[model samples]
Each structure stands twice: as structure tokens, then as C-alpha cells.
Target chain A: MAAGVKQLADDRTLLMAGVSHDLRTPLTRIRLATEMMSEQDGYLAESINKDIEECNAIIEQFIDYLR
Target chain B: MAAGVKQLADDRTLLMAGVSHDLRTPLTRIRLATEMMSEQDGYLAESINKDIEECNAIIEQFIDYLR
Candidate 1:
């Protein structure tokens, strides 16, 4: 209703995309730190790895709109 | 513009919201695991915590849009 509703919606999507896009860098660092943990912490590292996978998968879910 | 472009755009926003919503679960686990790491891995945990902070901050960026 306010100046091209379609464009406004697209803008919202862009904002969402931007936020999701920006998140990958930090997630990568988290994964890196998890991988570098000491030997005795193997199981903990594995759990964090799964978490990273879950996050990465969620980020990829945005690709449909971007592409 | 096929079949109410405005509605289509709104749907896209919802999908993005859903994806971001689902990501919080895994990110929480990753943070929890980082917190529980061995004492010797203090630096790694700290670094991972920072990463999680960045991620959480990014997620909060979406709140303005949603609210």
C-alpha cells in the first residue's frame, strides 16, 4: 500500500539475506575453534561440528531466494 | 508479477524467518559445547565464544525486521 508493496517486500528479503550472509564468517570461526580443541576433547569437538553443520545448512536455505 | 507479487514477496520473508528461527537451536548447542571444553582449552573456548557472539548479534539484526 505504500510505494510499491512488492519492492518493499523485496527489500525485506534483501535485509534477511544480508543478515544470513553476514553470519557465515563467524560460524566458520566457531567451527575452526572447535576443530582446534585439544585431544581429550574429541567428543565435544564432534558435537560442535554437528552444530556447525546445522547452521551451515540453515544458511544454505537462503540460497533459493538469492539465486 | 505473477499471482500477487506482494504476497509472493511476503511468503519469501516468512521462509527466511523460518530458516533463521531453526538455526538458533544448533548455534545454542555449539555455544554450550564450547563452554564445557577442557580447562586447558581456554583460549579456544574464548575464541569460539566470540564467534558465537558475532552470530547472535547477526541473528538479532533480523529482529528489527520481524518486529
Candidate 2:
């Protein structure tokens, strides 16, 4: 294989770790928050759903960026 | 195309992949180890760094159970 592929693969792995590690924080928080909000039986639950959708969109954007 | 852009991009991508794959090992380890540390609170908390700060924060608040 060419040197670039080896190099790129190594780099991509790093990106995966860095992104996953950093992003996991907000993503997990949103997921947990969504659950908590859903349990409260109020309009907050709907708001939480909005937050969840926003979070999902953020993740999707990241994926597109990667691609 | 510009030469520096190509060089720098290559370097950055290399860094990204290198970081991510190495991280996968620890994260996977954390999951399995947490199962072993089931009776304790430290398992999940132990391996996490800023990369995983999001999950840590949620878990810290017992938010892992979120809906």
C-alpha cells in the first residue's frame, strides 16, 4: 500500500476516538436528559423531545462532515 | 492544488485516526470492566477523560438511566 493510506487510516482512527470521546458528553447528556424529562409528566417532556431532536441533528451533521 | 494544504491535511487526518483507534481499546475495556465493577461506582468513572466527559457527567448524576 501507499504511504498515504497507512497514514490516513492512522489519522482516521484518531479522529474517531477524539470525536467519539468529545461528542459522547453532549450526546449522552441529551439522552439522559430526555429520559428524565419524559418522566416528569409535564410540558418539559415536549421541550426535552425538542432537545433530543436537536441532539440527533447535531450527530447527523457530524456524520455528514466526516463523509 | 496547494502543497501545504495537502501535507497538513494528511498530518491532521493521521492524528485523528491514531487517537481514535487507541481510544477504542480503553472504552471497550471500560465497558467490560464496569460490568466487573458492577457493585462499585468507580468503574465507569475511572477510564473516562475529557473525551468522555459527557458520559461521565451524566453517569455522575445517575443520568445513565435516562429515557
Candidate 3:
């Protein structure tokens, strides 16, 4: 039916628009953390590096799981 | 200090780069679904995959919120 097309259109576009918009936070965090690590030096800088790596790995694993 | 610099560069590059690139699952899915919709014929097949991928990406963002 014509309604089916309308409904389907609503569903696909809405979901994609929503999720694509929401993907920014993690992107921002990773970006900012990279910037931070580049600029900052301190006693725990080594630990900061490892934590960021671990976070990045988890993000990758999650992405793989989604795929 | 040289050793610290080396270690720092290794880990930071490893983490941010891995995470940045690993963020491609949703991307690949979106691409695939668009291809499917353009090529294949079905009732809800086009409706199904892309929306499902969007939901998945949203879930990924939610996981980021938990952090």
C-alpha cells in the first residue's frame, strides 16, 4: 500500500538521522583526548596513554560487534 | 626522557588511531544498506537493514554515555 511506503520511509530516515547525529560524542572524546595527550605532560601521562588506548580498543571491539 | 617520549608516542598513537578508525561499523552498514536499497527488491528489506544499523549505532553512543 502507499501507507507502507510512507511508514517505511519514516522508519528508515528517522532512525538513521537520529543515530548519525548521536555518534558525535565518542568522536569528540577521542579527538580531545588525542589533543590532550599531545599537549600535556605529567607524572601519570603514561597511565593516561594506556587508558586512552584501552578505551580506543573497546570502541573498536564494539564497532566490530556491531558489524 | 627519550624512553618516555617513545613510550608516550607509541601508546597515544595506538589508542586514538585505533579508535578513530574502528568507528567504521555503522559507516559500512549504512553504505551496504544504501546499496541494497538501490539494487534489490523487497517489501521491508530496505526498511529493515538501515534502521537496524541506526539502532546499533545509537546503542554504541549509549555505551559511550555510560563512560
Candidate 4:
């Protein structure tokens, strides 16, 4: 039963990482695309960029909470 | 024993949903940021949009698989 529990825990961690990994792809694209935008739009892009960083921190926090 | 298993599964599902919900914030921000960008970056933004859709589908899959 302990082994079964451990396996499920491992799977859960793997699944979380997988979801976060998939999310990072689009986040990267958005960050890169933002760089190519005009300065006028850069204002908004920078704000979003900061939020992305904040979001990234939350994922880290979630994992830590899981632990 | 069965009750313990059920509780564990329920916790797992809730945890997954929690993570997904946290992630959606940044993705939504990116989508909104894309809207404010110039047409030149539209191509890249749209691609990121599609991946966001794909990521959303994966989250659903993850939950269904947990079931």
C-alpha cells in the first residue's frame, strides 16, 4: 500500500510538471512576441510580462505547497 | 480503506484543478496582451493562442485520466 501511494505521488508530481511545461511554451512565445511589439504596446506587454513572472512564481509556490 | 482511496483521489483532482486555475490567469493576461499588440505580431500571438487551447485540452485530459 505504501508503494502504491508512493507511485501515485510520483505520478502526480510528473503530471504537474507536464502541465507546467506545456504552459511554458506559449508563455515563451508571448514573451518573445512582446519584444517585437511597438513601444506604445510595450507598456501593456511589459505589464503582462510582469504578470507572467508572477504567475510563474505561483506555480513554484504550488509545487512547494504540494511538498 | 476504500474511503481513504476515495479521499486521495478527490484531493488529487482538487489539486489538479487548483493548479490549472492558477495557470489560467497568466494565459488570460497573455491573450489580452496579444489583443493590444499590432497586426505585425498577430501571427505569433495567434499561434500562442492555439497552444493555450491545446494546453487547456491537456488539463481536461489530465483530470479525466485521474478519474
- Candidate 2, A51: how far from true, in Å? 1.3
TM-score, chain B, model 2, is: 0.44
Determine which window of 10 residues in candidate 2 chain B has minimal summed lDDT: B58-67
TM-scores, each model vs. reference? 0.52, 0.31, 0.26, 0.65
Global lDDT of model 1: 0.58
Q: Judged by DockQ, which candidate is best?
A: 4
Off by over 4 Å in 1: A1-17, A56-67, B1-24, B36-38
- The residue-level lDDT of candidate 4 at B65 comes to 53
After TM-score superposition, what is the CA distance of residue A46 in candidate 1 from its true location, in Å? 3.6
Query: Model 4 misses residue B21 by how many Å?
Result: 3.3
Candidate 1, pairs of clashing residues? none
User: Candidate 2's residue-wise lDDT over A1-67, tens digit each?
Assistant: 5555523333335544634455555435434433343344234334434444554454444444343
Tell me, by lDDT, which candidate is best.
4
RMSD of each: 6.3, 13.6, 23.8, 3.7
Cα-based lDDT for every prediction: 0.58, 0.40, 0.40, 0.63
Q: Who wins the TM-score comparison?
A: 4
lDDT of 3 by residue, A1-67 (tens): 3443322234334433544455444334333333333333232233333444554456445444232
Residue B11, candidate 4: how far off, in angstroms? Answer: 5.0
**Candidate 2 lDDT score at position A45:** 33
Give the winner by TM-score: 3 or 4. 4
